C-alpha cells in the first residue's frame, strides 16, 4: 500500500495495455502525482468500490531531451470486489500522422480490464445469475447496465439504460460463454439498438464464484464509433 495511489475490494491492478512499453502514464489527484510504466501495479486499495474514480492523466514520452505530452485528459477507474477496469477520457491529443499539432479531440477509450478471472472449467453447473452495475462513456458515467447469465446454457444477455445519448441505450444480444487461450470465461456478442445490429461487445466473468462481469462495448451511432465500459456485480 503506497501513498501516491492512496490519494483519496481489488487491491492491485497491473497496468499492461493502458500504457505501452515506451511511454509513461502520469496520474494526478489532489495535488499528488505518480508515474507508471508498463506492467506497474496500480494500488486500488484506498479507492472505493462501485464508484467511478477520476484522475487527471498525461501520457508522456521522451524525445532527445524533452518531455512530450502525447495525450492528456481524465483517467477513470471502476473498482469492484473482484474486478476493475480503466478508461481514457481524452481532452487533448497529438495528430502524429496528419498535422503534428495538439488538438482538443474529445474521445473515449477503454484500456485495461483485470481481476480474479473465473476459470471456464470451474463455472457453476447450472442456475441463473443477474448482474446490475454501471455503464460509462464519454461525458456520462451514470449508465445502468443489467446483464443476466444462464449458466445451464452458458449464455448471457443484457441491456444498457439511462445514458445521456439515447442511441447508446442498446440491447446486449445473447452470446455464448467460451474459454480464452488461458481458459478464461468470456462472452462476446453483438449490439442491438432498435432491432438492428449496431456494433459488438465483450465481457469477462470475474470472481471465484462468478460474482462479477466486466468489459467493453463498441457501438456504431450516427456520429460513428462509440466506446462504452461495462461493469456489473451481484
Amino acid at each position: 500500500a503506497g501513498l501516491a495511489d492512496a490519494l483519496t475490494g481489488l487491491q492491485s491492478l497491473t497496468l499492461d495495455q493502458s500504457v505501452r512499453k515506451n511511454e509513461k502514464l502520469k496520474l494526478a489527484a489532489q495535488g499528488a502525482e505518480k508515474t507508471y510504466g508498463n506492467g506497474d501495479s496500480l494500488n486500488t486499495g484506498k479507492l472505493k468500490n462501485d464508484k467511478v474514480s477520476r484522475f487527471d492523466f498525461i501520457r508522456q514520452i521522451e524525445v532527445d531531451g524533452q518531455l512530450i505530452t502525447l495525450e492528456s485528459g481524465e483517467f477513470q477507474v471502476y473498482k469492484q470486489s473482484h474486478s476493475a477496469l480503466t478508461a481514457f477520457q481524452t481532452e487533448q491529443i497529438q495528430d502524429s500522422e496528419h498535422s503534428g499539432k495538439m488538438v482538443a479531440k474529445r474521445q473515449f477509450r477503454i484500456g485495461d480490464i483485470a481481476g480474479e478471472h473465473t476459470s471456464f472449467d470451474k463455472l457453476p453447473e447450472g442456475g441463473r445469475a443477474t448482474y446490475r452495475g454501471t455503464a460509462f462513456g464519454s461525458d456520462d458515467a451514470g449508465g445502468k447496465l443489467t446483464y443476466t447469465i444462464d449458466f445451464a446454457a452458458k449464455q448471457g444477455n443484457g441491456k444498457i439504460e439511462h445514458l445521456k445519448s439515447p442511441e447508446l441505450n442498446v440491447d446486449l444480444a445473447a452470446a455464448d460463454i467460451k474459454p480464452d487461450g488461458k481458459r478464461h470465461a468470456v462472452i462476446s456478442g453483438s449490439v442491438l439498438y432498435n432491432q438492428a445490429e449496431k456494433g459488438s461487445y465483450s465481457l469477462g466473468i470475474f470472481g471465484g464464484k462468478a460474482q462479477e462481469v466486466a468489459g467493453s462495448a463498441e457501438v456504431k451511432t450516427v456520429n460513428g464509433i462509440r466506446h462504452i465500459g461495462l461493469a456489473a456485480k451481484q
Partner: antibody
Amino acid sequence: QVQMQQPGAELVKPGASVKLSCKASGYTFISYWMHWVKQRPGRGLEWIGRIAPDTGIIYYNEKFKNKATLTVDTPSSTAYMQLNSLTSEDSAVYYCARYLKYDGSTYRFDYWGQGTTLTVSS
Amino acid sequence: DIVMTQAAPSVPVTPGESVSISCRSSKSLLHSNGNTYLFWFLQRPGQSPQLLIYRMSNLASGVPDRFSGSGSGTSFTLRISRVEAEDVGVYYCMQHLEYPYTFGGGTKLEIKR
C-alpha cells in the same frame, strides 16, 4: 550530436533525374518528420514537401507535384528527393530540415542541412 | 496557399539602435489550440537558415534576448533591440499552420554605419 549530412553539390545534364540524399544522425529519426526547402540563387526560400518516416504520408506542394519524389530509408537514417526532367529553373540550393512530429518542443526547423547546390547544365 | 508578405525588402538601422520587421498573412495564423504557428528565421550570407523565433514569441536556443516577436493573427513583427554587426542577414517568416508551408519574401537588415 544532430548531424544532417548533405552532399556538397550535384551536377547533372538537363532533362535527366537526380537523387539528393540527406543522412541523419544524433536524433531518433522515426519521431522526426523531414522537410525539404528550395532556394534559387538570389531569391527566397520555397517549401517543396514533407516526408514522415513513421507512416509514409507525404504532403507535397502543388507546384512540385510531378517534379519531386520523396523517399525515406528509416533503417539507415536517410531521406531522398528525386528530381526528374530537370530544367534550368531547378538549379538551386536544396536544404533538408527536421521537424518533430509532436507539438510541444523546440525541435522543429531548429537543425538544417548544409544544402546541396544542384546545377543543371551540360 | 497562405500568402506571407514581407512589406520591406530591406530595412535600415544605425548601429546600436532598435528596428522592426513586419510580416503579413492571408489567413489568421492562430489555430484552435491557441498556439500561433509562426516561425522566424535569419539567413546569414552563405549559410543555411537558422531558427530564431518559434510559436511567434519564444526565443530559440542560444539566441540573444534583444530579439522579440509580436503580432496577433495577420500582422506580426520581429524587433531587434540593440543591433550588432552579427545580426545582419536576411529575415524570413514562415507559417506551419496549414499545408503547404509558405515562406516570406524576405527582409534584409542594412546597418547604416
